[PDB]
Amino acid sequence: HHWGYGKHNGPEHWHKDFPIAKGERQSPVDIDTHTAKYDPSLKPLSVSYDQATSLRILNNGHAFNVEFDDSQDKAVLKGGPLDGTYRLIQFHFHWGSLDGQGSEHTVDKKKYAAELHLVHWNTKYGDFGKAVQQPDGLAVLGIFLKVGSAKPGLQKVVDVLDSIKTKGKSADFTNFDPRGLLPESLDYWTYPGSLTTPPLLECVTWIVLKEPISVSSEQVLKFRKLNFNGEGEPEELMVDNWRPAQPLKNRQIKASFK
């Protein structure tokens, strides 16, 4: 009876195994754009993905992850609200059963169809597993998806999905360039928060881009054909793998623009 997003093990349940679910710096949150403080001391974000080495794509039973070689400074996030250098380890999405829901963060309570998370760890801690134990261990770049025009840079991901339909399936996924998933502007909001799945650790500096990317209806429909279950188990479509907004508590969301 492990955690999930089903009818009996979803976000409302997670606190029973992971009590930090009711903590003081949980994610996601609603971004109230009028209350967010413009901070002129924030720097432009530096996203250096030219040398990114993607390796593999994996259905982990809760999303799909595109994994990168993070054994050298190859794809790093710096600047913005960050001190030091954070290395890209993987990206994944959260999405809905319908175009009207799917994002984890919301903007003035607006839900987007999906949300992309580019997960990076602080190289001062040496590896991802040590970084998640630290308050400034991770930096997750969050990008909203809306349904409209296709995102050409997403299509290679969409086309490999039927090779990883079920939980535990993986596929080689080399030479994928994550710059193809960025919007034009790097304006952002930032706040201190957490992982949005168990173990819900409070180790994340969140950086959420204001500008969503557009993906086509056919592209997000393909995300919704994935399965939460393993091969030869009854089919449970992988949809609605997002956690609702959590109480902001004693936190301020800062804007880099405005």
Ligand X SMILES: CCOC(=O)c1sc(N(CCC(=O)O)c2ccc(S(N)(=O)=O)cc2)nc1C
2 marked as part of a ligand binding site: no
Other CB atoms closer than 10 Å to residue 72's CB: what's the count?
A: 11
Q: Is 62 labeled as catalytic in the residue annotation?
A: yes
- Helices first, then strands: H and E counts in the chain: 3, 15
Other CB atoms closer than 10 Å to residue 245's CB: what's the count?
A: 18
With 0-12 / 13-18 / 19 or more C-beta atoms within 10 angstroms meaning exposed / middle / buried, residue 100 is: exposed
128/196 Cα distance (integer angstroms): 16
Contacts for 33 with CB less than 8 Å, ≥ 6 apart: 107, 108, 255
Q: Which of residues 86-145 bind Zn ion (CB under 5 A)?
A: 117
190 marked as part of a ligand binding site: no
What is the nearest approach in angstroms of Zn ion to the Cβ of residue 38? Answer: 26
The CA radius of gyration of the chain, in Å to the nearest whole number, is: 17
Residue-level length of the chain: 258
Instruction: List the single partner that 155 binds among ligand X, Zn ion, none, CB under 5 to 8 Å by kind.
Output: none
Angle at 93 between CA 167 and CA 205, to 5 degrees: 120
1 marked as part of a ligand binding site: no
197 marked as part of a ligand binding site: yes
What is the nearest approach in angstroms of ligand X to the Cβ of residue 4? Answer: 12
What is the nearest approach in angstroms of ligand X to the Cβ of residue 154? Answer: 18
Residue with Cβ nearer ligand X (18 or 150): 18
| Closest residue by Cα to residue 208 from 110, 122, 125 | 110
Catalytic residue (choose from 1, 8, 62, 120): 62
Footprint of ligand X (CB under 6 A): 60, 62, 65, 117, 119, 132, 140, 195-197, 199, 201
Residue with Cβ nearer Zn ion (65 or 256): 65
Residue with Cβ nearer ligand X (9 or 60): 60
120 marked as part of a ligand binding site: no
What is the nearest approach in angstroms of ligand X to the Cβ of residue 206? Answer: 9
List the binding residues for Zn(2+).
92, 94, 117
Per the annotation, binding residues for substrate are: 196-197
> Active-site residue numbers?
62
